[PDB]
Amino acid sequence: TLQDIGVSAGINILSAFVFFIIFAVLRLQPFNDRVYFSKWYLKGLRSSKFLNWMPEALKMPEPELIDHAGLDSVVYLRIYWLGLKIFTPIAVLAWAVLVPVNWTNNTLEMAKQLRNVTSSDIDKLSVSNIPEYSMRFWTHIVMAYAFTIWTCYVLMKEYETIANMRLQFVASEARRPDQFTVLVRNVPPDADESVSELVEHFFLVNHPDHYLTHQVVCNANKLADLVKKKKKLQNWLDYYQLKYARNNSQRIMVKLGFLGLWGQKVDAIEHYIAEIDKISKEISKEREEVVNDPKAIMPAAFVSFKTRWAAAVCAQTQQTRNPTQWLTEWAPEPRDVFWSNLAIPYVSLTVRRLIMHVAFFFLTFFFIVPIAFVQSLATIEGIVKAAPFLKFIVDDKFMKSVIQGFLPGIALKLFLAFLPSILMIMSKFEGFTSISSLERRAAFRYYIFNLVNVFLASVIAGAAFEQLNSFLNQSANQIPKTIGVAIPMKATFFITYIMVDGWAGVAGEILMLKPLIMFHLKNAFLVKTDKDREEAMDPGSIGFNTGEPRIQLYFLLGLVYAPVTPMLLPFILVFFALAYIVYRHQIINVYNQEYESAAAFWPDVHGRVIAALVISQLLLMGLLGTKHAALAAPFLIALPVLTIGFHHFCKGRYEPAFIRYPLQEAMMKDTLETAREPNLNLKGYLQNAYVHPVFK
Amino acid sequence: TLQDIGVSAGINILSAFVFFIIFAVLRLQPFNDRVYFSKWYLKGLRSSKFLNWMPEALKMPEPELIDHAGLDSVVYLRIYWLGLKIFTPIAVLAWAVLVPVNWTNNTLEMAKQLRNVTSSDIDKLSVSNIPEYSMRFWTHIVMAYAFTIWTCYVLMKEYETIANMRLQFVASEARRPDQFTVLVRNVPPDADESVSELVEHFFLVNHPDHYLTHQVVCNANKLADLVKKKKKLQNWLDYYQLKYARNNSQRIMVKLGFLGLWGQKVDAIEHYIAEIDKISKEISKEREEVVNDPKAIMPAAFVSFKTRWAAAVCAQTQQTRNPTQWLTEWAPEPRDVFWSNLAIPYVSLTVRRLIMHVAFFFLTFFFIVPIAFVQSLATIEGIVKAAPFLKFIVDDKFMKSVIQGFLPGIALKLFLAFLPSILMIMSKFEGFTSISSLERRAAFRYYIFNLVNVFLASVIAGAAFEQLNSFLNQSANQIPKTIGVAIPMKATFFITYIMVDGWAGVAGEILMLKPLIMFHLKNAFLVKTDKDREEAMDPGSIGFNTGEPRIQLYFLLGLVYAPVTPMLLPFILVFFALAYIVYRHQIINVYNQEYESAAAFWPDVHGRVIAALVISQLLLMGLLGTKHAALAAPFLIALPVLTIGFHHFCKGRYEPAFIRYPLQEAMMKDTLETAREPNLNLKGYLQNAYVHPVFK
């Protein structure tokens, strides 16, 4: 009810203020400049009331921000702004029109008098309030068309602006050695010639006058694992030496701290010294073997040309008679390629794709179960017909509203908090050879997941657990009506879920608890010997993976509920306006960027918004049609066609700026480079990149 | 009924035998060698019981046929063979299984006793015969899966074989000047530089070391029209001079032979002599003006490179920042480009696309009307409840069956006989700049048209006009059952339609009446002066436009009715086995080929067969579901997913051989050419092509 939303708003605003106060206090501390200003030491420009950080984070213009942080960060900020642009006028129009319309009714009370268990006043501002009638449903349909038109226009304008930004950025970039290089990965085996000889012959004969050099990928996964283990064991050793120096009384370091009660054979500094020497010997032996092994060379290569023109030509064109051989794609940066998945033969790729599709389905089901549970939480208020657990409900009227709002949101947030990592593991199990593609794949998976589970499963479970009494004894001809009327109650639930997750999670994100705590532990109980802890800044990326599917889900909710129940929108607007400021400040100060794709993900964002638009229209059509309307279905079937047509137009006219490289731009860039730097030696600058850093 | 099919079979087999006898008699005549052996004078290898032409037309192997006729002709023959491969085992299995199953029933007679107006025994071998039950519907579903699996396997194998044929053919071709040339058509205007200067600068700077020459298209449509009119008027003049020489008695040649009763001012040889001189003067003046006009040069060009490698690179890659500027596509042959549509600015292209989509919709409706009429023909046998026109029905029992079979087929064939030309006009109104693309677009339009109109409209109209009595007085809950049961009656109609159209039309096609009659009139009443009537051989192409959508419709029917009513199939098999022989003979002897696309249309054929497969499965699902079945819908919803998945696999793995040119093949071809012909002068051989032949 409205009181539930009000108390949840009060508690979450208090939580946000507390978070901001804590953040200000921590930021003023001088021994924390190392953490809250990470992209000032990594960039190398620094060494060492309470809302004032908000207006000043808005001072740096985008022209300077693009050079400061990158392009992906600025395009992410533009997603947050796109939310405001789409939804503020839809919010204004939908409120000022539908709120007068849905309020003016009296017959629902008699309809709710029979056995309905709906709320009192929060559903009054929704479609379910009114019965079937001409003028009002006509206004709803007109509003649906207007909402789609405005959303599509804004998507078109923003998609043009992002295309211009990408094309202007790429053409004035640095000289990263990913512009001259493509990743040829299916090199067919041959008996009398090795991989390197085949790549040399093929790319010297069938692509001549422009081939400079090539590097073949090596399966050094074992060496990388050994190096990682040695590093971790050195961390343990250094921590234990610090422990010994702090308390030089006893060397008791028994390892009884793992499962199975194991950990005998007391494990002082000597054991790690011996283990470090052993692992170093094994590392040296393995490095020698892998350098001197033929089977360690996978069928793939990193071929580099003399001009970006030739590289674009080789990347955009099929290379041989067989479309599953000599596959060429734009090579990622050296600091981008996910080296661990370059050892996957190009059959296990599809095998793993199928396997992890199956895994995703099973995950979807096994998390439907907790969606059912969380909807059986405090939204269970209507179940009181049986009343076998009235004990906690009857304890108080106040906290019952407090539980009613807060607990479902926290339960769902905690339940899905560790899902982004599961999806990242799933994404990099099937192999993508670039952190950028891994992040985009995981974002797509998390979008599918939260769409299905969160939206559909939460709506279905909430209907089945609230209107349960209203169809327990009824017939099969009443189920559709219940499904039609159930949506606004899940609207009042999504109000609290958005409130908690969006507002509180964003405030917590700016507070930056995890990196701060990790830095202090790694600073106190770890090395603390010299100025060589600059590796302790690990602020991570913007986290496209964890952050973009969330805003896509918020787009989906805001579009679905804008005509159906235009009270969801103001909370969405507040979330966008707050997340934009917070994430802009974090882009400016914290948050290094691991990879630079130059806004290559915006096709995915636009496609997801279009899909959310189509879903919104289809549910509106189903709702109105189930609501005993006649002309609703003929009208709301044109919109899922006009939207697909407009998306196809945008695809055809603006997506090429994102998915393929114009040759004229390549030649212009090459000409400018050659004119400015005449004595540049490409081969020297270019041969030693792509060498799988463990080989150094 | 079965008697209707039998009498139609008798009459159509007699018609086919009569056609074949006439064809043999005409072929033995020596003054017709000029027509029945056209691709022996055009190829330049000739100068000057009754079924024996069938086995001998099967003697030439495909390796020699590909060099003889081309590749498109051989791939068309392979479509006819693909029909046999898909449908013979489906026919055998469906008969030997379902015919025992659907025959064994007794309860339909009581069901048909109430008021049903279905036939006696021809629907007994169909789905509608049996009521809802487990084992039989289970067998039908198993057969649906088996049919789809076999069809998909055969499509995959054939699509691989055609890809290999195309790749082997292209890589051993002649030196047509379409391998070195692409068609750049959106050259942006500039004030101080003409089109040719812009093309020179852009393709010399942004695509250098490989640019040879270029030709800009000129808007010489007016000159072409004048030349065509002059040629036609010369034909009239020559005919009238022959008339005067045959009868040198009076020069009366009054032109009273057109509409409006006009044609005074008697019009002897002198008037055409004066008109010919006038049109020649106007032609010369227009040629001078168009050569000396700046506005006659459209923004497009035919740019030609030095190696096929560079041309493939330029054709397969986006050329500039703006994806609607400098569009590059593989240039067609000089004897392929439809010169009349090279004067369309690249905005009117989409405008015309929309306009002719509207025209296609209106044509579809205005031919639904004659579909309703033709179904209100002899299949009207059930309407006798009202009996206001029993006069022709009661005239005889024999001819009533004869009309019952024959007349619907002839009516539908005559009604749609002039539709291919309407669709060709529609296709070339929107502009495609190549006879090949025009033919493929018209074939696609004719597929959509005959699918919608013929299949759906004929089925709906036949249901509404036959089972009319069975739902005139019934309620709205009986309509779905009538729709479910109506299909096999349209099966017995499609039996006769296929019989007439396929068998009789193919026999008539081999008879070659129209070209023969045109040749004799053009030989007798026209020039007959010297050996310069070799232009009188106009055998036309294989007519992909008119012939491929027909077989696509036959695929659709054969797949839809194979599980539903497995009596349609044998007639389809006979049609395929006959059309293959006839069209193979015609490929060998008659039928020059205007354009050589090297089997570039097979993606369209495969896509159409997949669409027909999906339609077959969806109608089976709807039929069984309407037929009071429980587990039918869950099973027949997986097939429209497995088919799309398999089609996507074939797309991804075999379509590149058809839609883009591998660079290694280009370089190999260039190397072989350079090694064999070292002194070749490309510029001389290549600059004068693409000059819009009227300029000569």
PDB file of N, CA and C in Angstrom, chain A residues 164 167-168 171 202 205-210 309 312-314 316-324 652-654 656-657 660-665 667-668, chain B residues 164 167-168 171 202 205-210 309 312-313 316-324 652-654 656-657 660-665 667-668:
ATOM      1  N   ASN A 164      28.602   9.192 -34.064  1.00  0.00           N
ATOM      2  CA  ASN A 164      29.543  10.276 -34.341  1.00  0.00           C
ATOM      3  C   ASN A 164      30.666  10.315 -33.316  1.00  0.00           C
ATOM      4  N   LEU A 167      33.135   7.475 -34.164  1.00  0.00           N
ATOM      5  CA  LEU A 167      33.921   7.691 -35.370  1.00  0.00           C
ATOM      6  C   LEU A 167      34.922   8.820 -35.190  1.00  0.00           C
ATOM      7  N   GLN A 168      34.565   9.868 -34.453  1.00  0.00           N
ATOM      8  CA  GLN A 168      35.531  10.926 -34.195  1.00  0.00           C
ATOM      9  C   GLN A 168      36.618  10.481 -33.230  1.00  0.00           C
ATOM     10  N   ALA A 171      39.249   7.918 -34.998  1.00  0.00           N
ATOM     11  CA  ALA A 171      40.076   8.554 -36.010  1.00  0.00           C
ATOM     12  C   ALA A 171      41.080   9.536 -35.432  1.00  0.00           C
ATOM     13  N   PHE A 202      50.790 -18.106 -46.050  1.00  0.00           N
ATOM     14  CA  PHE A 202      49.465 -17.679 -46.472  1.00  0.00           C
ATOM     15  C   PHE A 202      49.348 -16.165 -46.476  1.00  0.00           C
ATOM     16  N   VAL A 205      51.580 -14.598 -49.363  1.00  0.00           N
ATOM     17  CA  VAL A 205      51.144 -14.843 -50.729  1.00  0.00           C
ATOM     18  C   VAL A 205      49.770 -14.256 -50.992  1.00  0.00           C
ATOM     19  N   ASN A 206      48.791 -14.595 -50.161  1.00  0.00           N
ATOM     20  CA  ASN A 206      47.409 -14.207 -50.389  1.00  0.00           C
ATOM     21  C   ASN A 206      47.044 -12.904 -49.709  1.00  0.00           C
ATOM     22  N   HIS A 207      48.018 -12.144 -49.242  1.00  0.00           N
ATOM     23  CA  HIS A 207      47.695 -10.820 -48.739  1.00  0.00           C
ATOM     24  C   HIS A 207      48.948  -9.952 -48.762  1.00  0.00           C
ATOM     25  N   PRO A 208      49.624  -9.816 -49.895  1.00  0.00           N
ATOM     26  CA  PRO A 208      51.009  -9.346 -49.893  1.00  0.00           C
ATOM     27  C   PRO A 208      51.089  -7.829 -49.864  1.00  0.00           C
ATOM     28  N   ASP A 209      52.324  -7.333 -49.931  1.00  0.00           N
ATOM     29  CA  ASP A 209      52.628  -5.907 -50.017  1.00  0.00           C
ATOM     30  C   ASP A 209      52.230  -5.156 -48.755  1.00  0.00           C
ATOM     31  N   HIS A 210      51.664  -5.861 -47.779  1.00  0.00           N
ATOM     32  CA  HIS A 210      51.211  -5.208 -46.561  1.00  0.00           C
ATOM     33  C   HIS A 210      51.396  -6.055 -45.311  1.00  0.00           C
ATOM     34  N   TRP A 309      44.881   0.379 -43.173  1.00  0.00           N
ATOM     35  CA  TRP A 309      44.065   0.028 -44.326  1.00  0.00           C
ATOM     36  C   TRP A 309      44.083  -1.472 -44.559  1.00  0.00           C
ATOM     37  N   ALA A 312      42.218  -3.406 -41.795  1.00  0.00           N
ATOM     38  CA  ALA A 312      40.768  -3.330 -41.948  1.00  0.00           C
ATOM     39  C   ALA A 312      40.291  -4.219 -43.084  1.00  0.00           C
ATOM     40  N   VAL A 313      41.039  -4.237 -44.184  1.00  0.00           N
ATOM     41  CA  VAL A 313      40.698  -5.098 -45.310  1.00  0.00           C
ATOM     42  C   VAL A 313      40.731  -6.560 -44.897  1.00  0.00           C
ATOM     43  N   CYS A 314      41.758  -6.958 -44.149  1.00  0.00           N
ATOM     44  CA  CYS A 314      41.871  -8.352 -43.744  1.00  0.00           C
ATOM     45  C   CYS A 314      40.823  -8.727 -42.712  1.00  0.00           C
ATOM     46  N   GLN A 316      37.688  -7.333 -42.335  1.00  0.00           N
ATOM     47  CA  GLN A 316      36.304  -7.225 -42.774  1.00  0.00           C
ATOM     48  C   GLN A 316      35.941  -8.181 -43.899  1.00  0.00           C
ATOM     49  N   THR A 317      36.887  -8.957 -44.411  1.00  0.00           N
ATOM     50  CA  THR A 317      36.656  -9.784 -45.583  1.00  0.00           C
ATOM     51  C   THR A 317      36.943 -11.246 -45.279  1.00  0.00           C
ATOM     52  N   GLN A 318      36.115 -12.127 -45.832  1.00  0.00           N
ATOM     53  CA  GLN A 318      36.355 -13.554 -45.692  1.00  0.00           C
ATOM     54  C   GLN A 318      37.670 -13.925 -46.353  1.00  0.00           C
ATOM     55  N   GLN A 319      38.414 -14.827 -45.719  1.00  0.00           N
ATOM     56  CA  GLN A 319      39.797 -15.051 -46.098  1.00  0.00           C
ATOM     57  C   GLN A 319      40.028 -16.279 -46.962  1.00  0.00           C
ATOM     58  N   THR A 320      39.113 -17.235 -47.010  1.00  0.00           N
ATOM     59  CA  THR A 320      39.399 -18.434 -47.786  1.00  0.00           C
ATOM     60  C   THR A 320      38.100 -19.108 -48.206  1.00  0.00           C
ATOM     61  N   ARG A 321      38.255 -20.190 -48.970  1.00  0.00           N
ATOM     62  CA  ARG A 321      37.126 -20.955 -49.483  1.00  0.00           C
ATOM     63  C   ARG A 321      36.238 -21.472 -48.363  1.00  0.00           C
ATOM     64  N   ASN A 322      36.835 -21.796 -47.223  1.00  0.00           N
ATOM     65  CA  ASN A 322      36.131 -22.418 -46.112  1.00  0.00           C
ATOM     66  C   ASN A 322      35.815 -21.375 -45.052  1.00  0.00           C
ATOM     67  N   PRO A 323      34.545 -21.066 -44.783  1.00  0.00           N
ATOM     68  CA  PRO A 323      34.242 -19.990 -43.834  1.00  0.00           C
ATOM     69  C   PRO A 323      34.523 -20.346 -42.391  1.00  0.00           C
ATOM     70  N   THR A 324      34.930 -21.578 -42.098  1.00  0.00           N
ATOM     71  CA  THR A 324      35.351 -21.966 -40.757  1.00  0.00           C
ATOM     72  C   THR A 324      36.847 -22.246 -40.712  1.00  0.00           C
ATOM     73  N   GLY A 652      20.372  -0.576 -40.015  1.00  0.00           N
ATOM     74  CA  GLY A 652      20.947  -0.413 -41.332  1.00  0.00           C
ATOM     75  C   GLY A 652      21.729   0.868 -41.524  1.00  0.00           C
ATOM     76  N   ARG A 653      21.341   1.947 -40.847  1.00  0.00           N
ATOM     77  CA  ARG A 653      21.941   3.248 -41.172  1.00  0.00           C
ATOM     78  C   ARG A 653      23.009   3.705 -40.183  1.00  0.00           C
ATOM     79  N   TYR A 654      22.940   3.258 -38.931  1.00  0.00           N
ATOM     80  CA  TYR A 654      23.918   3.728 -37.964  1.00  0.00           C
ATOM     81  C   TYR A 654      24.780   2.625 -37.364  1.00  0.00           C
ATOM     82  N   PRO A 656      26.664   0.211 -38.906  1.00  0.00           N
ATOM     83  CA  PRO A 656      27.981   0.087 -39.537  1.00  0.00           C
ATOM     84  C   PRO A 656      29.068   0.922 -38.891  1.00  0.00           C
ATOM     85  N   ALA A 657      28.745   2.086 -38.338  1.00  0.00           N
ATOM     86  CA  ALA A 657      29.770   2.852 -37.646  1.00  0.00           C
ATOM     87  C   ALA A 657      30.310   2.112 -36.434  1.00  0.00           C
ATOM     88  N   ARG A 660      31.778  -2.173 -38.468  1.00  0.00           N
ATOM     89  CA  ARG A 660      32.800  -2.342 -39.490  1.00  0.00           C
ATOM     90  C   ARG A 660      33.513  -1.029 -39.765  1.00  0.00           C
ATOM     91  N   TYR A 661      34.761  -1.151 -40.215  1.00  0.00           N
ATOM     92  CA  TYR A 661      35.691  -0.038 -40.279  1.00  0.00           C
ATOM     93  C   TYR A 661      35.748   0.513 -41.689  1.00  0.00           C
ATOM     94  N   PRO A 662      35.323   1.749 -41.922  1.00  0.00           N
ATOM     95  CA  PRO A 662      35.442   2.332 -43.256  1.00  0.00           C
ATOM     96  C   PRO A 662      36.885   2.444 -43.704  1.00  0.00           C
ATOM     97  N   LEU A 663      37.113   2.132 -44.977  1.00  0.00           N
ATOM     98  CA  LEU A 663      38.464   2.151 -45.521  1.00  0.00           C
ATOM     99  C   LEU A 663      39.005   3.563 -45.672  1.00  0.00           C
ATOM    100  N   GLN A 664      38.154   4.526 -46.020  1.00  0.00           N
ATOM    101  CA  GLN A 664      38.644   5.887 -46.184  1.00  0.00           C
ATOM    102  C   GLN A 664      39.214   6.419 -44.881  1.00  0.00           C
ATOM    103  N   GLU A 665      38.557   6.118 -43.761  1.00  0.00           N
ATOM    104  CA  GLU A 665      39.072   6.548 -42.466  1.00  0.00           C
ATOM    105  C   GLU A 665      40.418   5.907 -42.172  1.00  0.00           C
ATOM    106  N   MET A 667      42.663   4.928 -44.363  1.00  0.00           N
ATOM    107  CA  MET A 667      43.693   5.537 -45.197  1.00  0.00           C
ATOM    108  C   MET A 667      44.007   6.952 -44.743  1.00  0.00           C
ATOM    109  N   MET A 668      42.999   7.696 -44.293  1.00  0.00           N
ATOM    110  CA  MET A 668      43.248   9.042 -43.794  1.00  0.00           C
ATOM    111  C   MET A 668      44.122   9.008 -42.548  1.00  0.00           C
TER     112      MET A 668
ATOM    113  N   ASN B 164      29.812 -25.877 -53.502  1.00  0.00           N
ATOM    114  CA  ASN B 164      31.022 -26.360 -54.167  1.00  0.00           C
ATOM    115  C   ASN B 164      30.976 -26.100 -55.665  1.00  0.00           C
ATOM    116  N   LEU B 167      31.725 -22.359 -56.236  1.00  0.00           N
ATOM    117  CA  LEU B 167      33.103 -21.968 -55.980  1.00  0.00           C
ATOM    118  C   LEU B 167      34.052 -22.552 -57.012  1.00  0.00           C
ATOM    119  N   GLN B 168      33.800 -23.772 -57.480  1.00  0.00           N
ATOM    120  CA  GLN B 168      34.643 -24.325 -58.530  1.00  0.00           C
ATOM    121  C   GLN B 168      34.405 -23.644 -59.869  1.00  0.00           C
ATOM    122  N   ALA B 171      36.004 -19.896 -59.963  1.00  0.00           N
ATOM    123  CA  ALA B 171      37.457 -19.892 -59.951  1.00  0.00           C
ATOM    124  C   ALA B 171      38.068 -20.425 -61.236  1.00  0.00           C
ATOM    125  N   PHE B 202      38.767  10.149 -55.250  1.00  0.00           N
ATOM    126  CA  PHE B 202      38.486   9.275 -54.121  1.00  0.00           C
ATOM    127  C   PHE B 202      39.090   7.897 -54.327  1.00  0.00           C
ATOM    128  N   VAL B 205      43.054   8.068 -54.157  1.00  0.00           N
ATOM    129  CA  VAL B 205      43.638   8.357 -52.858  1.00  0.00           C
ATOM    130  C   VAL B 205      43.290   7.290 -51.837  1.00  0.00           C
ATOM    131  N   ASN B 206      42.006   6.994 -51.675  1.00  0.00           N
ATOM    132  CA  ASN B 206      41.542   6.090 -50.636  1.00  0.00           C
ATOM    133  C   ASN B 206      41.438   4.655 -51.107  1.00  0.00           C
ATOM    134  N   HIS B 207      42.010   4.326 -52.251  1.00  0.00           N
ATOM    135  CA  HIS B 207      42.062   2.926 -52.633  1.00  0.00           C
ATOM    136  C   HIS B 207      43.180   2.720 -53.648  1.00  0.00           C
ATOM    137  N   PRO B 208      44.410   3.118 -53.351  1.00  0.00           N
ATOM    138  CA  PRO B 208      45.410   3.316 -54.400  1.00  0.00           C
ATOM    139  C   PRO B 208      46.106   2.015 -54.765  1.00  0.00           C
ATOM    140  N   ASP B 209      47.079   2.135 -55.667  1.00  0.00           N
ATOM    141  CA  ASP B 209      47.942   1.038 -56.090  1.00  0.00           C
ATOM    142  C   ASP B 209      47.174  -0.043 -56.840  1.00  0.00           C
ATOM    143  N   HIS B 210      45.865   0.136 -56.993  1.00  0.00           N
ATOM    144  CA  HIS B 210      45.053  -0.873 -57.655  1.00  0.00           C
ATOM    145  C   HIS B 210      43.922  -0.294 -58.491  1.00  0.00           C
ATOM    146  N   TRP B 309      41.549  -9.215 -56.713  1.00  0.00           N
ATOM    147  CA  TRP B 309      41.720  -9.042 -55.277  1.00  0.00           C
ATOM    148  C   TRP B 309      41.230  -7.673 -54.840  1.00  0.00           C
ATOM    149  N   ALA B 312      37.400  -7.338 -55.108  1.00  0.00           N
ATOM    150  CA  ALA B 312      36.707  -8.012 -54.014  1.00  0.00           C
ATOM    151  C   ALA B 312      36.824  -7.221 -52.722  1.00  0.00           C
ATOM    152  N   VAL B 313      38.006  -6.661 -52.469  1.00  0.00           N
ATOM    153  CA  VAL B 313      38.207  -5.837 -51.284  1.00  0.00           C
ATOM    154  C   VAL B 313      37.295  -4.622 -51.314  1.00  0.00           C
ATOM    155  N   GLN B 316      33.442  -5.781 -50.850  1.00  0.00           N
ATOM    156  CA  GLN B 316      32.997  -6.399 -49.608  1.00  0.00           C
ATOM    157  C   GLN B 316      33.143  -5.502 -48.389  1.00  0.00           C
ATOM    158  N   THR B 317      33.697  -4.305 -48.538  1.00  0.00           N
ATOM    159  CA  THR B 317      34.007  -3.453 -47.402  1.00  0.00           C
ATOM    160  C   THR B 317      33.317  -2.105 -47.533  1.00  0.00           C
ATOM    161  N   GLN B 318      32.836  -1.588 -46.407  1.00  0.00           N
ATOM    162  CA  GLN B 318      32.247  -0.258 -46.396  1.00  0.00           C
ATOM    163  C   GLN B 318      33.294   0.773 -46.774  1.00  0.00           C
ATOM    164  N   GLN B 319      32.885   1.767 -47.556  1.00  0.00           N
ATOM    165  CA  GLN B 319      33.841   2.647 -48.205  1.00  0.00           C
ATOM    166  C   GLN B 319      34.029   3.993 -47.528  1.00  0.00           C
ATOM    167  N   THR B 320      33.114   4.438 -46.678  1.00  0.00           N
ATOM    168  CA  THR B 320      33.284   5.766 -46.106  1.00  0.00           C
ATOM    169  C   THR B 320      32.533   5.868 -44.786  1.00  0.00           C
ATOM    170  N   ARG B 321      32.671   7.033 -44.153  1.00  0.00           N
ATOM    171  CA  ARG B 321      32.038   7.307 -42.869  1.00  0.00           C
ATOM    172  C   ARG B 321      30.528   7.152 -42.937  1.00  0.00           C
ATOM    173  N   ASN B 322      29.941   7.475 -44.083  1.00  0.00           N
ATOM    174  CA  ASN B 322      28.496   7.495 -44.251  1.00  0.00           C
ATOM    175  C   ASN B 322      28.044   6.235 -44.971  1.00  0.00           C
ATOM    176  N   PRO B 323      27.266   5.353 -44.341  1.00  0.00           N
ATOM    177  CA  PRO B 323      26.912   4.092 -44.999  1.00  0.00           C
ATOM    178  C   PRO B 323      25.921   4.246 -46.132  1.00  0.00           C
ATOM    179  N   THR B 324      25.408   5.448 -46.380  1.00  0.00           N
ATOM    180  CA  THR B 324      24.553   5.710 -47.530  1.00  0.00           C
ATOM    181  C   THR B 324      25.258   6.606 -48.543  1.00  0.00           C
ATOM    182  N   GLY B 652      24.886 -19.772 -41.796  1.00  0.00           N
ATOM    183  CA  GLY B 652      26.196 -19.406 -41.306  1.00  0.00           C
ATOM    184  C   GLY B 652      27.343 -20.148 -41.959  1.00  0.00           C
ATOM    185  N   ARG B 653      27.130 -21.397 -42.369  1.00  0.00           N
ATOM    186  CA  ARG B 653      28.272 -22.211 -42.805  1.00  0.00           C
ATOM    187  C   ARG B 653      28.405 -22.334 -44.322  1.00  0.00           C
ATOM    188  N   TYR B 654      27.303 -22.217 -45.060  1.00  0.00           N
ATOM    189  CA  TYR B 654      27.406 -22.387 -46.501  1.00  0.00           C
ATOM    190  C   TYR B 654      26.999 -21.157 -47.303  1.00  0.00           C
ATOM    191  N   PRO B 656      28.079 -17.912 -47.067  1.00  0.00           N
ATOM    192  CA  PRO B 656      29.215 -17.101 -47.515  1.00  0.00           C
ATOM    193  C   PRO B 656      29.761 -17.480 -48.875  1.00  0.00           C
ATOM    194  N   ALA B 657      29.707 -18.751 -49.261  1.00  0.00           N
ATOM    195  CA  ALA B 657      30.156 -19.107 -50.598  1.00  0.00           C
ATOM    196  C   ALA B 657      29.304 -18.457 -51.673  1.00  0.00           C
ATOM    197  N   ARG B 660      29.658 -13.658 -50.449  1.00  0.00           N
ATOM    198  CA  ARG B 660      30.876 -12.861 -50.412  1.00  0.00           C
ATOM    199  C   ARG B 660      32.053 -13.645 -50.963  1.00  0.00           C
ATOM    200  N   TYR B 661      33.026 -12.902 -51.489  1.00  0.00           N
ATOM    201  CA  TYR B 661      34.095 -13.457 -52.300  1.00  0.00           C
ATOM    202  C   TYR B 661      35.345 -13.639 -51.461  1.00  0.00           C
ATOM    203  N   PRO B 662      35.806 -14.864 -51.243  1.00  0.00           N
ATOM    204  CA  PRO B 662      37.052 -15.063 -50.508  1.00  0.00           C
ATOM    205  C   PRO B 662      38.239 -14.439 -51.213  1.00  0.00           C
ATOM    206  N   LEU B 663      39.110 -13.817 -50.423  1.00  0.00           N
ATOM    207  CA  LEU B 663      40.269 -13.134 -50.982  1.00  0.00           C
ATOM    208  C   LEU B 663      41.307 -14.103 -51.521  1.00  0.00           C
ATOM    209  N   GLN B 664      41.483 -15.254 -50.875  1.00  0.00           N
ATOM    210  CA  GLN B 664      42.479 -16.201 -51.359  1.00  0.00           C
ATOM    211  C   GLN B 664      42.141 -16.670 -52.763  1.00  0.00           C
ATOM    212  N   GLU B 665      40.859 -16.915 -53.032  1.00  0.00           N
ATOM    213  CA  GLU B 665      40.450 -17.316 -54.373  1.00  0.00           C
ATOM    214  C   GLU B 665      40.737 -16.219 -55.386  1.00  0.00           C
ATOM    215  N   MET B 667      43.105 -13.947 -55.222  1.00  0.00           N
ATOM    216  CA  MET B 667      44.539 -13.866 -55.469  1.00  0.00           C
ATOM    217  C   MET B 667      45.031 -15.056 -56.273  1.00  0.00           C
ATOM    218  N   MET B 668      44.470 -16.239 -56.033  1.00  0.00           N
ATOM    219  CA  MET B 668      44.864 -17.408 -56.811  1.00  0.00           C
ATOM    220  C   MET B 668      44.490 -17.237 -58.277  1.00  0.00           C
TER     221      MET B 668
END
